[PDB]
Design an enzyme around this catalytic site. Structure first.
Site, short mmCIF file in Angstrom:
data_model
loop_
_atom_site.label_atom_id
_atom_site.label_comp_id
_atom_site.label_asym_id
_atom_site.label_seq_id
_atom_site.Cartn_x
_atom_site.Cartn_y
_atom_site.Cartn_z
N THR I 1 0.86 -1.21 0.00
CA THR I 1 0.00 0.00 0.00
C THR I 1 0.88 1.25 0.00
O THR I 1 1.88 1.24 0.71
CB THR I 1 -0.91 -0.02 1.22
OG1 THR I 1 -2.04 -0.84 0.92
CG2 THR I 1 -1.39 1.34 1.63
N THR I 2 0.54 2.25 -0.80
CA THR I 2 1.29 3.54 -0.82
C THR I 2 0.29 4.65 -0.50
O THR I 2 -0.68 4.76 -1.23
CB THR I 2 1.90 3.82 -2.20
OG1 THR I 2 2.55 2.63 -2.63
CG2 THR I 2 2.92 4.92 -2.19
N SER I 129 3.64 -0.07 2.31
CA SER I 129 4.77 -0.87 1.76
C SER I 129 5.56 -0.07 0.71
O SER I 129 6.78 -0.27 0.63
CB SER I 129 4.28 -2.16 1.18
OG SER I 129 3.25 -1.93 0.23
#
Ligand SMILES: [Cl-]
Ligand SMILES: [Mg+2]
Ligand SMILES: [Mg+2]
Ligand SMILES: [Mg+2]
Ligand SMILES: [Mg+2]
Lengths: 195, 125, 228, 226, 222, 204, 212, 196, 196, 195
Positions: I1-2, I129
């Site tokens: 995930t960003t 992440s």
């Protein structure tokens, strides 16, 4: 564990139970009576985890003696066995289950019939002509299967029991220091003092 | 390939002579003179630096070699054979003694080890 | 039982003739990641106490709130809250020490090493340590984590025994602390150049220095080193 | 154990403490951790005591043979290469952590080597349980172009840090100074700041205090003549 | 995983005289190979002429000593300021220790004082509260280094009278407070040399009918 | 399970004025069971004395090994091995089993026949040499021996004084170890006479 | 540890060793392994020193409350069962206890109950518990008779501990002797194993294997 | 560790930090991670210090032997010898290697050899613990055929960020410039690259 | 995930990817990771989908009940409620939360609450992440007092890189712009941000 | 295998070895001889891991019988015990060690003395007046420590051994089915066929 045998003949139930109590390295006692009288015409032999065996046996005995006084009446062997099964069936899903196996030898005074019930620590009840717990069955059942007749006398039952103990004393690694034998009939419970 | 000479090249002749040892001694006889003298408080070993050419730097050729701090060796005969024996003598002083006893071997025992190497070249294949 | 996530490194401190000094860098590490660069780990309590905290930052922020709550509670029905019945360093420490030991005894610790630096009512220097186990000890010099290994040896050369405390000036004590913070920056892989330094003096009170940097660093000998 | 090596103007100095420990127990109160690979190449060992001693004598032996073979004084880079290739082959199972220092025709050298076979170069190095205590002193007081007297001072000060602050280190300070174009001077118990105070009482027993069952002469001599 | 226990090292020694008792301890506090404090007091005056030390994990040690001191204060409140006898203090500490039988205080506890006949007394406890009155007891890191020495030099074990050759034992003659302190100092000096966790300072608390007195002595700081 | 504390037993060596002493208990056991009260742990090859604690099979094996090696040494060298040289031989012999070691705590004691200098040395199980001036300790009660020796020992003790010191050091250390005792022997070693004394001690 | 208790004509003999060990290290040689519950009841210590001490002291409190309420000496049967029912409640928790409860009452006579931390309660004539129990049993079994004199019975109990103290590494220090009568227990002293061994060896002619 | 190699007009530039860490202790804060195999072939080492140093010594040996027989080896040949050692002994090694070299025929070249022992020829390569933080930055700032000065700035700025964020990285930024002119060593100190 | 939040002149901007992964399988490729708790207070969720969604629902309920009694909560107040849940239940939770809100007195504010349950007020925050790859880029490119357009470009470029390198990140870039004017939703598709 | 005892009296060595062979659940045999004659005046009893015990005993037997033929001479009991110890000491650091414990009872014809050697699987040799392996010592050594005299007769040794076996049969949990007893004296090796 310790050897506990049972055989239901014509007019009585015979319970044979080893005399040895071993704590690891040493045999602490060679005269231990692994039985409790629940009522005048009902006897229960037991074998399992140290402490739990006697604690359970005496707990059952107290409850059956309480019922006997309250109702002024002896429960049938079947009724006593059902009570014991429920207590073990309750126990297995407890925080710390009783690791105790029992034989219940009783003479039903209503039906005039001897009865033998085999119950393991899980609460697995079966009515049998002859029963055992642990490895005792493995050595003895082949002899009992061969010789057992439902119309056997008490004396014939004791003779077949002697042949069973002799086979155990030959092929079992552990010295169980012989057996105390008790007969349950219409006249109640008595111990065979020479065996 | 493989060394297929697994048999002795030195053998007893009918007269009981070991030819190759006798001939080796003849090669020593042709060699330049070297000597040793033992005093009460020391030993001396000496030889001639027979320079093959005047252009050659005879200081770079060592005929007298240190084996251990307290043992020295000089030779007569074939120089190359001496040089490799010095290399073997220096190493055997360590492997078969110093690495076991944590001290340098006594003269007689190092001599014994060099002797054993020279005996084996007399019987080995 | 937990594991520390966001962490602060060494807190170093020492006694001098008139008071105590304490220091701690402004870094919040996330394992090997130098994630947060603006974290204050010296938390003053009144004008007489500074609590320095290393280890888990989330547990530090909790302790920070307990101390803030302690000051509020002390002021309740207390006409002498800013005088005789003000919070002492010894009161603040014993409270924290109680909490730390109670929390380890429930198998749910505050994952910290804490140094309480301050000056008592009678002008006595206070400096005592407590950690996640509830272990307590006092010494002329105290340091947590990496500081214990590198800082203490340097600070103990200034103040080795108790008898050295009266012979140590604030200028010598601060110089030693600042040098120790430079050594820790060189050798601690989870240290930062930016740090805070607090002086609690019995005469000049609490001086709190923010945005201090490690300076006068030696790197010029690196050019000479070639290969391995 | 606390071991340091410090480079100075015309050579290198190596120092160590004198405590060997069997866990919490102190086996030898005046151990010698400064070993000789060759006359002007000394090293000091932390980790498994048997391994550091054994690996020095093996490389020290092979270095002496190499020196005799090549007619040249042994080099530190040779000792270095032979130590790392030996230790790497045994994948850290030989627990030898060494600081190697010395002077040779090339000049003065200071290296460290770990059990797994990695090596480190520097002007100042430390090793052992007291390495952090020692490195703190080195990082505080080291400067370029140290004199012999300054280097010995810095080295011994770094060991003292270990002795006092590290439980794994204690007792005395051994030093060896290796200066270019000079004999390496080995200074044993250079500092002795941990002498035991006189006991309060003598524990010499009266003769006959111990109960004896049998006595006999032990024959240590060979089989005799006649 | 979280380990609620630690080892702060340290060594303590209790000796009972004829009309006195000493409880001694080193002032060094450690974790692993680091020194926390060179002077962190370990032996405490608990009032009623009783001295106590709980050596091992310093947190559990401080907790127990704190709770016992508290027990002495409440014994006074509940029982009309009656003096807590050493035998009564001992039994009380058993109950404090066994209270946490299934999460023990990781300490070896020694108390010293005078019994109700005015004779020297020392009581020794395990972590879970088993206790016994003893003449001579060392505790902690260097206990194994000290006790054999005390067996020999206090109880005169394996010592016989010259000329008899094992037939007559060396008689057990009573030791003075000066004689006991000499053996305590030599015990800790010897322990300091051979045990890395022992050193810095020695603090001795002496208990007589006159009260509690303190003596401090330097130990090697390496 | 721990090979160095199955059989049990202790050795201690000390230096006096122109003399050395080496002493050992006589117990061999199978953990809790006492098996033998005559298992001597001190051997000698000429004038060099070797005490060995630890696993009893390795104690016997190393004695047979060092007898073997010192016998070949004498035949070739034409002289008895000295303490200093024998120490290096023990060290060499132990380290050649680096990754499969003898579970032993050897102790060398003797007087150099030429210099007359009293010598003692100790080794860990892989051959690291502890060359102490004062004393060497080994076995399951090594902690106890370190305590006794550190307090009881003073330098330059006469042979008959050194006997009392090493005897009391062993006896009181052994009485605080379950796996040591069941008798004790003390060797008093002078340049050209060695006395061997069996001590009376408690048999529990 | 070595503890025994046996029934005979004269009452009960209780004999114990004195050694306490932490690994190879001998912590104490002066441990009381007989707990004096009350003047008429004795208990032996094996397994957990604290567990045995604490809970058999507690038993003495329960026994005292019983005779205050019932105005009659508690039976050995009742006293033993209070302890066995208590430890059975803690089963699994990790109590370590192996002990003999000994008493001499009118209704029972001399009685010994082996009580154990996994809940076992056995009445018996001879019991031996500890690391050196097997050694003690050997001497007991070959020499025991009901019609032993108080003097001979006391010696047999002493000799049986000595046998264990010698062979078992974790047994020794000294022997504590007790004689339990109907009117209460009598203490028959502390006997150093070191001095006792040599005395027995000479007088008895036993332990020929050992040089003295 | 933070190390990277960049292909530019003049040739190739290799950069690295100078920190060697044992847990949270900086063992050496001025280590040279740029070790030469040949005159104009350098390698940057990441992973096990023992494993990487052992392999670097063997390659230098192979290239020295190669040169004596077959003349100057190519950068590809140097990378191939590395890969062979790393791939065949992948079970007993922890080594991440960047190889940067300069031929006159092939000019500047960069090869990366990650843990597996695979080979990848790239215009630029990043490796070591610190590289993870500058994947974004390097991708958006790398151009082909930059000048020497531009490439020095790109590596200086890149390793600066990777040092800022990675605890395992720090100290001085060392750089080696491989061109036709020869070999140039550069060093940049904290006071310079921290204020970027 | 960003995910990331950025403080600017006008207010604050939150950005995220749209990928939800189960091992290697993309379960949902167009998930909305920007969840509102109040009108002008949003949260970006990272870690356990179950844990993060459960907590978000509770905080939303707390701010609703807060508003009914005490009026509009501060962004600080919203961050505090999250920290309380995350800190007190740190043993049973895996949640990393960025909180971005707009007051009229406080204007734009960004708070991050990592795994531990600590609170950090920052000019901008990155999490998930993908964030590890853009620490270098974001630090070099972030300025204080940027315009709306500049901040959108900064987040677009940042998450672009983080999507490029992180396998756990991808899909569309969703953004939420919190200003005095109100709430604006923005979406950017692969074909747009990939060619940046 | 289980119990092996040895007692050296005035003029002989007596070895007693259990007859039982148990494979887990069943006693497969009750007449097993756990001994091998190494030489006319040397006997070795053995107990340990199944298969390894007999394999080792027969291997030793073969090696001593080979030596006897080669030299036309019987090795001393001391020499035989030293050979056996070295083989076990070699074995313990092997790929798969022999898990075998042995007693070696021999009569030395040169010294005219009986000799008993106890050797465990590690190669731990001791010369004893009486010995055992496993748990056999724990029950019997207190009786032997008491009654044993070095001037004892063979008949007195057998009487003491009967007392040792009786104590084992009482306190040991396992039934080892009695013992085979063998005497080693100047006249060689014979078996007591009634015990
Ligand atoms: Cl023997
Ligand atoms: Mg010390
Ligand atoms: Mg003993
Ligand atoms: Mg014993
Ligand atoms: Mg950094």
């Amino acid at each position: 564990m310790d050897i506990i045998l049972g055989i239901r003949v014509q007019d009585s139930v015979i319970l044979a139970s080893s005399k040895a109590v071993t704590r690891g390295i040493s045999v602490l006692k060679d005269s231990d009576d692994k039985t409790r009288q629940l009522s005048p015409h009902t006897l229960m032999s037991f074998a399992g985890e140290a402490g739990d065996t006697v604690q359970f046996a005496e707990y059952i005995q107290a409850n059956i003696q309480l019922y006997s006084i309250r109702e002024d009446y002896e429960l049938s062997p079947q009724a006593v066995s059902s009570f014991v099964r429920q207590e073990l069936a309750k126990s297995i899903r407890s925080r710390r289950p009783y690791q105790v196996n029992v034989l219940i030898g009783g003479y039903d005074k209503k039906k005039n019939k001897p009865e033998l019930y085999q119950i393991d620590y899980l609460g697995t009840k079966v009515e049998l002509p002859y029963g055992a717990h642990g490895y005792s069955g493995f050595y003895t059942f082949s002899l009992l299967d061969h010789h057992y007749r439902p119309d056997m006398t008490t004396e014939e039952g004791l003779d077949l029991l002697k042949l069973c103990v002799q086979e155990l004393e030959k092929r079992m690694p552990m010295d169980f220091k012989g057996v105390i034998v008790k007969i349950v009939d219409k006249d109640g419970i008595r111990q065979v003092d020479d065996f | 390939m493989t060394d297929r000479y697994s048999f002795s090249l030195t053998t007893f002749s009918p007269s009981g002579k070991l030819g190759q040892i006798d001939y080796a001694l003849t090669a020593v006889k042709q060699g330049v003179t070297s000597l040793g003298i033992k005093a009460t408080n020391g030993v001396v070993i000496a030889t001639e630096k027979k320079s093959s050419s005047p252009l050659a730097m005879s200081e770079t050729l060592s005929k007298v070699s240190l084996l251990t701090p307290d043992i020295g060796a000089v030779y007569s005969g074939m120089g190359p054979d001496y040089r490799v024996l010095v290399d073997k003598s220096r190493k055997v002083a360590h492997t078969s003694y110093k690495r076991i006893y944590g001290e340098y071997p006594p003269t007689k025992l190092l001599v014994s080890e060099v002797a054993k190497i020279m005996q084996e070249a007399t019987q080995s294949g | 039982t937990q594991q520390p996530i966001v962490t602060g490194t060494s807190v170093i401190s020492m006694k001098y003739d008139n008071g105590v000094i304490i220091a701690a860098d402004n870094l919040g590490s996330y394992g090997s990641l130098l994630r947060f660069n603006g974290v204050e780990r010296l938390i003053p309590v009144g004008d007489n106490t500074v609590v320095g905290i290393s280890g888990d930052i989330s547990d530090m922020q909790h302790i920070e709130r307990l101390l803030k709550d302690l000051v509020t509670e002390n002021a309740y029905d207390n006409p002498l809250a800013d005088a005789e019945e003000a919070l002492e360093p010894s009161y603040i420490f014993e409270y924290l020490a109680t909490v730390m030991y109670q929390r380890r005894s429930k198998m749910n610790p505050l994952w910290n090493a804490i140094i309480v630096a301050g000056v008592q009512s009678n002008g006595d220097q206070f400096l005592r340590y407590v950690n996640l186990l509830g272990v307590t000890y006092s010494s002329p010099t105290l340091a947590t984590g990496f500081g214990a290994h590198m800082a203490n040896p340097l600070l103990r050369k200034v103040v080795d025994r108790e008898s050295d405390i009266p012979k140590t000036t604030v200028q010598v004590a601060e110089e030693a602390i600042v040098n120790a913070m430079r050594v820790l920056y060189y050798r601690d892989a989870r240290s930062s150049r930016n740090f805070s330094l607090a002086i609690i003096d019995k005469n000049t009170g609490l001086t709190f220095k923010k945005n201090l940097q490690v300076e006068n660093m030696k790197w010029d000998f690196a050019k000479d080193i070639k290969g391995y | 154990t606390t071991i340091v090596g410090v480079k100075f103007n015309n050579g290198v100095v190596i120092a160590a403490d004198t405590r060997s420990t069997q866990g919490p127990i102190v086996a030898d109160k005046n151990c010698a951790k400064l070993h000789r690979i060759s006359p002007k190449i000394w090293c000091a060992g932390a980790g498994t005591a048997a391994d550091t001693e054994a690996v020095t004598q093996l490389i020290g032996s092979n270095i002496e043979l190499h020196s005799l073979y090549t007619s040249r004084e042994p080099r530190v880079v040779s000792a270095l290469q032979m130590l790392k290739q030996h230790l790497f082959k045994y994948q850290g199972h030989i627990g030898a952590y060494l600081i190697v220092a010395g002077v040779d025709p090339t000049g003065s050298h200071l290296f460290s080597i770990h059990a797994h076979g990695s090596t480190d170069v520097g002007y100042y190095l430390s090793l052992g349980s007291g390495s952090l205590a020692a490195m703190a002193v080195l990082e505080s007081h080291w400067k370029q172009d140290l004199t012999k007297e300054e280097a010995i001072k810095l080295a011994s000060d770094a060991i003292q840090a270990g002795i006092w602050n590290d439980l794994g280190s204690g007792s005395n300070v051994d030093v060896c100074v290796m200066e270019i174009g000079k004999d390496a001077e080995y200074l044993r118990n250079y500092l002795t700041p941990n002498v035991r105070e006189e006991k309060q009482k003598s524990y010499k027993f009266p003769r006959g205090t111990t109960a004896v069952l049998k006595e006999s002469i032990v024959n240590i001599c060979d089989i005799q003549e006649e | 995983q979280f380990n609620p226990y630690g080892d702060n090292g340290g060594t303590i020694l209790g000796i009972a005289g004829e009309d006195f008792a000493v409880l001694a301890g080193d002032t060094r506090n450690i974790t692993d190979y680091s020194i926390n404090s060179r002077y962190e007091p370990k032996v405490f005056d608990c009032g009623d002429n009783i001295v106590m030390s709980a050596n091992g994990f310093a947190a559990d040690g401080d907790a127990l000593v704190k709770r016992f001191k508290n027990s002495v204060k409440w014994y006074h409140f509940d029982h009309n300021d009656k003096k807590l006898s050493i035998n009564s203090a001992a039994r009380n500490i058993q109950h404090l220790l066994y209270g946490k039988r299934f999460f023990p205080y990781y300490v070896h506890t020694i108390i010293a004082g005078l019994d109700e006949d005015g004779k020297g007394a020392v009581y020794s406890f395990d972590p879970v509260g088993s206790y016994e009155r003893e003449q001579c007891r060392a505790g902690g890191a260097a206990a194994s280094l000290i006790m054999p020495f005390l067996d020999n030099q206090v109880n005169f074990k394996n010592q016989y009278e010259p000329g008899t050759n094992g037939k007559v034992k060396k008689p057990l003659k009573y030791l003075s407070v000066e004689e006991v302190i000499k053996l305590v100092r030599d015990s800790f000096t010897s322990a300091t040399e051979r045990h890395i966790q022992v050193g810095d300072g020695l603090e001795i608390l002496i208990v007589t009918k006159d009260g509690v007195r303190k003596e401090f002595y330097e130990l090697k700081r390496d | 399970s721990d090979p160095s504390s199955i059989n049990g037993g202790i050795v201690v060596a000390m230096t006096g004025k122109d003399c050395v002493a080496i002493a050992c208990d006589l117990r061999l056991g199978s953990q809790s069971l006492g098996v033998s009260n005559k298992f001597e742990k001190i051997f000698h090859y000429g004038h060099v004395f070797l005490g060995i604690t630890g696993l009893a099979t390795d104690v016997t094996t190393l004695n047979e090994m060092f007898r073997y090696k010192t016998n070949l040494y004498k035949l070739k060298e034409e002289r008895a091995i000295e303490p200093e040289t024998f120490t290096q031989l023990v060290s060499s012999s132990l380290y050649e089993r680096r990754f499969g070691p003898y579970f032993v705590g050897p102790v060398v004691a003797g007087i150099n026949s030429k210099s007359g200098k009293p010598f003692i040395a100790g080794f860990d199980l892989i051959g690291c040499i502890d060359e102490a001036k004062d004393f060497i300790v080994s076995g399951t009660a090594s902690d106890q021996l370190f305590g006794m020796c550190e307090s009881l020992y003073e330098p330059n003790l006469e042979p008959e004084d050194l006997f009392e010191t090493i005897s009391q050091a062993l006896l009181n250390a052994a009485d605080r170890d379950a796996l040591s005792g069941w008798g004790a022997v003390v060797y008093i070693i002078k340049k050209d006479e060695v006395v061997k004394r069996y001590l009376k001690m408690r048999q529990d | 540890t070595t503890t025994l208790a046996f029934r005979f004509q004269g009452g009960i003999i209780v004999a114990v060793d004195s050694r306490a060990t932490a690994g190879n290290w001998v912590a104490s040689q002066t441990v009381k392994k007989v707990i004096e519950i009350n003047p008429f009841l004795l208990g032996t210590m094996a397994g957990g020193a604290a567990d045995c001490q604490f809970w058999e002291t507690w038993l003495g409190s329960q026994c005292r409350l019983h005779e205050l309420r019932e105005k009659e000496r508690i039976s050995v049967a009742a006293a033993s069962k209070i302890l066995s029912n208590l430890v059975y409640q803690y089963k699994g928790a990790g109590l370590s206890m192996g002990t003999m409860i000994c008493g001499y009452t009118r209704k029972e006579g001399p009685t010994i109950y082996y009580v154990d931390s996994d809940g076992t309660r056995l009445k018996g004539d001879i019991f031996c518990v500890g690391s050196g129990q097997t050694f003690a049993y050997g001497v007991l079994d070959s020499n025991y008779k009901w019609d032993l004199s108080v003097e001979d019975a006391l010696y047999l109990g002493k000799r049986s501990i000595l046998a264990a103290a010698h062979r078992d590494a974790y047994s020794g220090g000294s022997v504590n002797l007790y004689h339990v009568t109907e009117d209460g227990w009598i203490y028959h002293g502390n006997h150093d194993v070191g001095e006792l061994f040599w005395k027995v060896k000479e007088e008895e002619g036993s332990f020929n294997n050992v040089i003295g | 560790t933070t190390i990277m190699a960049v292909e530019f007009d003049g040739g190739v530039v290799m950069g690295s930090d100078s920190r060697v860490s044992a847990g949270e202790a900086v063992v050496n804060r001025v280590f040279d991670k740029l070790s030469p195999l040949h005159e104009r072939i350098y390698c940057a080492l990441s992973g096990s210090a023992a494993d990487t140093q052992a392999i670097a010594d063997i390659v230098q040996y192979h290239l020295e032997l190669y040169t004596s027989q077959y003349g100057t080896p190519s950068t590809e040949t140097a990378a191939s010898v590395f890969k062979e050692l790393c791939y065949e002994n992948k079970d007993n090694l922890t080594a991440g290697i960047i190889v940067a070299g300069y031929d006159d025929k092939n000019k500047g070249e960069v090869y990366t050899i990650p843990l597996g022992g695979s080979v990848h020829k790239l215009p630029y390569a990043i490796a070591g613990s610190g590289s993870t933080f500058i994947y974004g930055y390097c991708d958006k700032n790398f151009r082909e055929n930059m000048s020497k000065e531009e490439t020095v700035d790109f590596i200086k700025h890149s390793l600066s960020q990777a040092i800022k964020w990675d605890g395992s990285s720090g100290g001085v930024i060392r750089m080696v410039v491989l061109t036709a002119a020869g070999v140039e060593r550069l060093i940049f100190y904290p006071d310079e690259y921290e204020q970027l």
